[PDB]
Amino acid sequence: GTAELDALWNLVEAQYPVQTAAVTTLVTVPDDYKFEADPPSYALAGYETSEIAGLKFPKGFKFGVAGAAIQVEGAAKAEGRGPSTWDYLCHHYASTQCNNYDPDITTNHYYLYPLDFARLQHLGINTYSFSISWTRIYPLGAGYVNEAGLAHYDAVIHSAKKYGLEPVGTVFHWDTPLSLMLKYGAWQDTGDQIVKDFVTYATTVFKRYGNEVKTWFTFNEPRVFCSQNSGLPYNLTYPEGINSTSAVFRCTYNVLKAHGHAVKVYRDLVASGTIAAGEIGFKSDDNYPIPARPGNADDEESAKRHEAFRIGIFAQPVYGNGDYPDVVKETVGDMLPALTDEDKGYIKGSGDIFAIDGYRTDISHAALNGIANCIRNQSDPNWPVCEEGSDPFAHVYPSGFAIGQSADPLSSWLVNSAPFIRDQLKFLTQTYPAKGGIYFSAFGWAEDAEYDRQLLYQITWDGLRTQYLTDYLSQLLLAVHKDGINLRGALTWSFVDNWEWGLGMQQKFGFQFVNQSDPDLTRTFKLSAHAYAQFGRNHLHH
Amino acid sequence: GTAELDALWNLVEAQYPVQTAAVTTLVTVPDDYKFEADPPSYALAGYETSEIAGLKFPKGFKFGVAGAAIQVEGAAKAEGRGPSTWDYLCHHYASTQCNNYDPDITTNHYYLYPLDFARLQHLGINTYSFSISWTRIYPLGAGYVNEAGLAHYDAVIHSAKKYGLEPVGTVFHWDTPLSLMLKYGAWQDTGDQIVKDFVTYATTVFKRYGNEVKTWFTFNEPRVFCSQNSGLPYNLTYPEGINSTSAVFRCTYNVLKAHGHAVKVYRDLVASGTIAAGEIGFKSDDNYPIPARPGNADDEESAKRHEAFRIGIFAQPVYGNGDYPDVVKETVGDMLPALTDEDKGYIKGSGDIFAIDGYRTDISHAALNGIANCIRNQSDPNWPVCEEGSDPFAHVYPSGFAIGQSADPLSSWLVNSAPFIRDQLKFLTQTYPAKGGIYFSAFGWAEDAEYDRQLLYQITWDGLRTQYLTDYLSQLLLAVHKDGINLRGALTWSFVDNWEWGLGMQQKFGFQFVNQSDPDLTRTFKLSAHAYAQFGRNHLHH
């Protein structure tokens, strides 16, 4: 091994070493694998509305699940991988930033992916969304390439297709190479090295997999990702001139450039015939919130500010007119870099497909101390949106009632807001049109206190997750038939309980349970998985 | 004699005294009382299915709520009340038996009943089920009567009727006078003084209220109650030869005798014209489970034994042939006093109406070591039912999936088993026929971890309780029209988060939240409260 690689992992493991999973050997799926038995036939009763009878998704609709490399894989040091910022963060600040978990092992999907795909095939899933661990490809972020890393995902893509699973690839899902952060501040780079290094990485994976993967996303939820750059460990290494309030908007600019340059490479690769033709975008999230008091110009202004800061700041340069929303530039000023002419050439139109992580719709209350007062105070707790961002407002009507069912309070951003899906999709497809249509790239549930159950039968009958997915899929189906949305697919987060960033393995978003108390991390289907399978059975073509 | 109440309350308050609520006056309800606003109109959908469309409950159907004196009243020492066994227990074993709560104050419904009823009227409730604290009437259980106690419930009954709530009265809901337990044991009385004392007590309340209260239950869930007499504080004072076990079955007989004698008096009072004619029974609970493996003779046997020990042991003497179930006679008997013919003369036919606290339906797995070996070993953990009684069996098919959604793990006995309700009602009304029909006398939900929520909007959108109540009401509604069941009403446990026995105020059963972190214990409506209200509008007569 290369010494700089060893130094980085020594650094990360200075307080505690990377833990090694029970089993570390590509598992083999016996042809006689026995799935656990189906739930009672009555369990799925009355989840569906009669309003969707006979309706089918379009031919080719992507009906699938989502995971992310660092969230499901484990094998943090296997086969030459280098450390990311999250390996460092959680090996150094586990008790204050990571709920005493780390991503060393997670669900062990790095070694168990063949079994997972077999279990996904049993439910009729037809699409598998995954992310590439950058550090499996470039262990130092730049420089030498790790052939074992490229080869792992070769094997991953082939088994999935073997199990009927169309692979959909995200190049970057938040697992920043630690090395690039130390060298020059990674996404806070005041220069352009992060773009050069990212495009090289993207070129390699495009060349290696572009013949097999025909739907690509550059970045997963860049607004959420860049907002993290205001925190540890990014703020141990800010470049000179960089604050922790602008680490988010310098990241915004660097990310928009990385996306544009990468899409050009992807399109050049297609136009040269090197890889099969496909579609590329990035996954947006959040929403265009409803005013707390309808018709009130203040609530509408804070709703617009929210859309612009949570969606427009990335989607308007790419799928709209090619510039930032006007409200963002005016409030942030010189913290947000201006788009040079060359930048707009790459960024504007650099999205074949729109993708929305449509977990929910919020409610926007204008700041009680005034939006005009708030936008002028970077120290205001509601800056820069200048709505009331705290939970007792963002989810609550003046009536005091919530917009909808709340999920686990540790993921209090999450609510069941199915009635609003069709409105978001009309807004997104009219404002950020993409020639390839729109994906529902991530929706899912954290059932309240599911981590405190100790007996499996209590876990597997997961009613509120099971009806979220049904509510959401139903509105998705009506968006196609009643609204003509060019909806390309529905991907649920996630297929297994996994490592949910700062919340670790405590928070359960899976429709399969993962027995952390089992060295084998053995798997078992929840009711919500069978509801997902059946909705597929009723509303997919075959 | 005297009012040696002081000796008794000093005993109870020996470790710490009874706490006094912040409000100890009768509240007055302003005519302009403003209710909190309704939830979004787009709520309540997908609960009511298409299958119960156009169906109505019978004219006069009691569509109401249930509470109990020691669970909602508080005022444990107000206006002359004597102590109950639960006052003693929770002031002495708070940390080990009462989850560090006591019923001193509870929801303070003793003083807030006018506001509670005004709020119930706002939802269109027409029936209010309540119990009388025996110790408010006879503070020493027998002897001197507390006129203030009798007069309090006069004011409650008159106010309830004023708010459109037909009052339904339960004579005894587990609050045994401590004095009677100490004097000669409670229901473990080897003589017959407890029957005399109860009958004297029942007569007083029948005379005072029978012109206003026309539906009566003697005992709430006596099988559950008598099983409590195997625990503290009852087992500090058994009058030998009564050992634990020999405590549950002496109680069953004394209660059956108490029930039969009290019902006879009730009938003499009606027949003499002293009180308006009404109906009287008792509230059964539990269920006749389903065999884990259908057609298996062992699972069918343990299911039958379960019904017999949980329903038949009280219901067969009262509504059936007048004797214990044969399987009960065969296993116990040497612990169970024989029902004399004079006993049978009072007990047989002493139920004008049946009532089932139909929380759930269980699954019966025959004991893994054989029923025959379990029944002959009083020390087997599965004696005397000799099914597998533990949670991983009682709720689980051999397939490993649950019978239905589980509730809060501290009330793990509770599951949503709506699909089996109709099957339960046919068995009960064909096996234990009553001329007045059958009441669904309690059902309700303990929403998982609702006690851990910190923000009101998260508490009030209670999706699975809303679901539970609509699912059950829908099956009740289908039971009348498809099965012709003479179902007389539906009463939900409960209208407010109350004091659940040993769990104290931690467990949340209300369709209104009671902010126990208030000096006023302010009530706020949950979604299930409006769901209960909405179902009434859609399916009641009025």
Ligand SMILES: OC[C@H]1O[C@@H](O[C@@H]2[C@H](O)[C@@H](O)[C@H](O[C@H]3[C@H](O)[C@@H](O)[C@@H](O)O[C@@H]3CO)O[C@@H]2CO)[C@H](O)[C@@H](O)[C@H]1O
């Ligand atoms: O399963 C995890 C879940 O996380 C979700 O992110 C949530 C919101 O979508 C996102 O807007 C919000 O943004 C936070 C950021 O994470 C915090 O670090 C902090 O800086 O404040 C921001 C808001 O100002 O984060 C939420 C979770 O914390 C993802 O959307 C979802 O895909 C899942 O990954």
Ligand SMILES: OC[C@H]1O[C@@H](O[C@@H]2[C@H](O)[C@@H](O)[C@H](O[C@H]3[C@H](O)[C@@H](O)[C@@H](O)O[C@@H]3CO)O[C@@H]2CO)[C@H](O)[C@@H](O)[C@H]1O
């Ligand atoms: O408070 C919630 C709910 O509790 C219900 O009682 C539960 C079961 O119905 C009942 O069968 C069970 O009986 C227990 C008993 O409490 C124990 O002391 C011991 O004897 O084991 C028995 C089971 O074999 O108790 C359950 C709650 O503890 C009530 O019926 C209902 O009204 C509610 O109060």
Ligand SMILES: *[C@@H]1O[C@H](CO)[C@@H](O[C@@H]2O[C@H](CO)[C@@H](O)[C@H](O)[C@H]2NC(C)=O)[C@H](O)[C@H]1NC(C)=O
């Ligand atoms: C560096 O990032 C850290 C941690 O991610 C920020 O830590 C937060 O600090 C604020 C201010 O005290 C606390 O209120 C937060 O609760 C901390 N967040 C959590 C939970 O991690 C820290 O402020 C950032 N440092 C700088 C440069 O400001």
Ligand SMILES: *[C@@H]1O[C@H](CO)[C@@H](O[C@@H]2O[C@H](CO)[C@@H](O)[C@H](O)[C@H]2NC(C)=O)[C@H](O)[C@H]1NC(C)=O
């Ligand atoms: C998660 O795995 C643990 C460990 O394997 C399980 O605990 C064991 O359960 C088996 C059931 O066959 C028992 O035979 C063992 O005795 C248990 N081990 C212990 C700790 O005593 C646990 O049941 C699993 N949890 C779930 C939800 O499946």
Ligand SMILES: *[C@@H]1O[C@H](CO)[C@@H](O)[C@H](O)[C@H]1NC(C)=O
């Ligand atoms: C007496 O009661 C307590 C619970 O109240 C119980 O633990 C104990 O086992 C009971 N029986 C005996 C043996 O006294």
Ligand SMILES: *[C@@H]1O[C@H](CO)[C@@H](O)[C@H](O)[C@H]1NC(C)=O
């Ligand atoms: C209780 O007494 C019965 C007889 O009434 C006896 O058979 C049983 O073994 C005793 N058990 C104890 C000591 O709990």
Ligand SMILES: *[C@@H]1O[C@H](CO)[C@@H](O)[C@H](O)[C@H]1NC(C)=O
């Ligand atoms: C009775 O059951 C106990 C366990 O509950 C067992 O240990 C004891 O040996 C049994 N006695 C017989 C002979 O069944």
Ligand SMILES: *[C@@H]1O[C@H](CO)[C@@H](O)[C@H](O)[C@H]1NC(C)=O
């Ligand atoms: C209960 O009331 C207290 C004080 O008024 C308040 O702080 C708290 O938010 C209330 N509880 C809820 C969750 O509504």
Ligand SMILES: *[C@H]1O[C@H](CO)[C@@H](O)[C@H](O)[C@@H]1O
């Ligand atoms: C995976 O890695 C482990 C290291 O603990 C080995 O023991 C195993 O043989 C496999 O190579």
Ligand SMILES: *[C@H]1O[C@H](CO)[C@@H](O)[C@H](O)[C@@H]1O
């Ligand atoms: C009891 O009466 C007092 C006044 O004596 C009130 O303040 C209270 O609200 C309740 O009505």
